[PDB]
Design a protein around this nucleic acid. Structure first.
Ligand SMILES: O=[N+]([O-])c1ccc2c(ccn2[C@H]2C[C@H](O)[C@@H](COP(=O)(O)OP(=O)(O)OP(=O)(O)O)O2)c1
Ligand SMILES: [Mg+2]
Ligand SMILES: [Mg+2]
Ligand SMILES: [Mg+2]
Ligand SMILES: [Mg+2]
Ligand code: NA
Length: 533
DNA sequence: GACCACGGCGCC
DNA sequence: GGCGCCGTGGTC
């Protein structure tokens, strides 16, 4: 790309671009270039130059596509060396790291970024050649998904701003009641948001027993777990837990979200990061819309602020127990497979032992938590029960589901020999510490390693389903808005919502037939909370 | 102003 | 197990 040639570039060229800020819905496009065949082409006027491209091909392609969609241009993302690198090794998460590893330097200049995209793609493509399964994942899942995500990002989701504003004032008044009570009990005001100040008050001034210490600096912890244990030692504790809940939700959702509404769309626009996790899941940021509250009453009130466009409805679809079903398929356990083929339910079953949607959620931490290496001592204090018999409550699980333990053992042994583990579709995660000589490190690694094929296969299935579903939705005049790992949120014209729900449900359930059926629960509503029933 | 480590905590 | 964001106490 050494030789400068006039804009525009020939087709197939790789693009480089510089944004005033990371978020493509908010960014000014500062510069735009393209590189091909020993030539680099710099655009004199980036916005207008955008009209010359047939597709965004290069590093961070989806970001340029989103910005183009923002500007009303149907420019899809194409090849992206980040996706190749991320499939080769999902620790490849940044252009900085990928450049250093595969043969260049990530700079702040568009031409250089275009030249770099071209060279990295050449080096990665060949590496990803011969890896037929990763190649299939690239062509059939990741590359097409990037176009789907680009449209989700540019579309956004409507937020009831007036509602959240009123909710803010109400929550502020309750926070004031809580602070005032805490200060009376402490005998003096202090910064209740400072865990250092709180630690002194609880443990030095009120003489409460310390329970645990913090990881890096060894302070006496004031975490929810510690406070819960101290709930009956002093009236101040309950008030602090309530304060923690309200301030967490006010500072993270109630106050920030209304300020993130885009002036042009009137909606909230998240970023779905495609090379961000060790397992093949997506992440969401700026804002994060994959962690909107749902558990507590105030949380639920916040979830109600997410609403459909006037005259449309939200459709929410959630895979049922997807990780357990995946485990059944991967392990081949007959008992577990039978549980699903018959129609039994695992989450609800542990719930009654320990049933509405509230007490069923708590079961999720249990069944799942125990499944992924949770120590009995953990389950003990997490279930509020005697540490006995063993274990015990965790035991026998492997007895009734024997093939699961065997799958775990085989997964680890293979991970030790090859240095990585894989999903059903061959997505890999390298786990070098499986051979660490320090037990705590090695066992932490083991839990990461055997988790990945389960979490990652579930992620693979959801991505493939999004790729299958997206074009059907366009045809029906419906929109895909959000993904939350095992859930999708769509928006449909009211008259069509029912037909969309039915279709979307079939597509997600039939995505890839397993030894067990995939089941999908679906709700329709004017807001996110009511759409999940 | 920007950025950092940490503890803490929201969701799957 | 997997994420990203917040306020505090802090540096530059
Ligand atoms: O270790 N943990 O504590 C732990 C580990 C994994 C966990 C959770 C809580 C959820 N997951 C995983 C497992 C699932 O893939 C997804 C959660 O999905 P979900 O909340 O919709 O619960 P499902 O298991 O899918 O069942 P459900 O949708 O019918 O309630 O994320 C907790
Ligand atoms: Mg589910
Ligand atoms: Mg779910
Ligand atoms: Mg951290
Ligand atoms: Mg400060
Ligand atoms: Na290559």
């Amino acid at each position: 790309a050494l030789e400068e040639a006039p804009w525009p570039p020939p087709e197939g060229a790789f693009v480089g671009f510089v944004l005033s800020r990371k978020e493509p819905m908010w960014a000014d496009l500062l510069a735009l270039a393209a590189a091909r065949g020993g030539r680099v082409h710099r655009a004199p006027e980036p916005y207008k130059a955008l009209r010359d491209l047939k597709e965004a091909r290069g590093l961070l392609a989806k970001d340029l596509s989103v910005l183009a969609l923002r500007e009303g241009l149907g420019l899809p993302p194409g090849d992206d060396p980040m996706l190749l690198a991320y499939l080769l090794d999902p620790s490849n998460t940044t252009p900085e790291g990928v450049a250093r590893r595969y043969g260049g330097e990530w700079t702040e200049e568009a031409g250089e970024r275009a030249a770099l995209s071209e060279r990295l793609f050449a080096n990665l493509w060949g590496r990803l050649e011969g890896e037929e399964r990763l190649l299939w994942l690239y062509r059939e899942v990741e590359r097409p998904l990037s176009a789907v995500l680009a449209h989700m990002e540019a579309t956004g989701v409507r937020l009831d701003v007036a509602y959240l504003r009123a909710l803010s004032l109400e929550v502020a008044e309750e926070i004031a009641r809580l602070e005032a009570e805490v200060f009376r009990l402490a005998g003096h005001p202090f910064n209740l948001n400072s865990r250092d100040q709180l630690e002194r008050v609880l443990f030095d001034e009120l003489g409460l027993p310390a329970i645990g210490k913090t990881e890096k600096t060894g302070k006496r912890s004031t975490s929810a777990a510690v406070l819960e244990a101290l709930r009956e030692a002093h009236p101040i504790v309950e008030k602090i837990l309530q304060y923690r809940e309200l301030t967490k939700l006010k500072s993270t959702y109630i106050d920030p979200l209304p300020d993130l509404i885009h002036p042009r769309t009137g909606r909230l626009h998240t970023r779905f990061n495609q090379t961000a996790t060790a397992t093949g899941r997506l992440s969401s940021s700026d804002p994060n819309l994959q962690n909107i509250p749902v558990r507590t009453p105030l949380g639920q009130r916040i979830r109600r602020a997410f609403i459909a466009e006037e005259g449309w409805l939200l459709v929410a679809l959630d895979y049922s127990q997807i990780e357990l079903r995946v485990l059944a398929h991967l392990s081949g356990d007959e008992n577990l497979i039978r549980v699903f083929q018959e129609g039994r339910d695992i989450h609800t079953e542990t719930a009654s032992w320990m049933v509405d949607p509230l007490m069923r959620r708590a079961a999720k931490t249990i069944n799942f938590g125990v499944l992924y290496g949770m120590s009995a001592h953990r389950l003990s204090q997490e279930l509020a029960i005697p540490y006995e018999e063993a274990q015990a409550f965790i035991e026998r699980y492997f007895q009734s589901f024997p093939k699961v333990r065997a799958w775990i053992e085989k997964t680890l042994e293979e991970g030790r020999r090859r240095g990585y583990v894989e999903t059903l579709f061959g997505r890999r995660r390298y786990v070098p510490d499986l051979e660490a000589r320090v037990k705590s490190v090695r066992e932490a690694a083991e839990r990461m390693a055997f988790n990945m094929p389960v979490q990652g296969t579930a992620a693979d299935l959801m991505k493939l389903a999004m790729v299958k579903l997206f074009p059907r939705l366009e045809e029906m005049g419906a929109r895909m808005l959000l993904q939350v790992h095992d859930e999708l949120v769509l928006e449909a014209p009211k008259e069509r919502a029912e037909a969309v729900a039915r279709l979307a449900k079939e597509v997600m359930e039939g995505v890839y037939p397993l030894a067990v059926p995939l089941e999908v629960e679906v709700g329709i509503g004017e807001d996110w909370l009511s759409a999940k029933e």
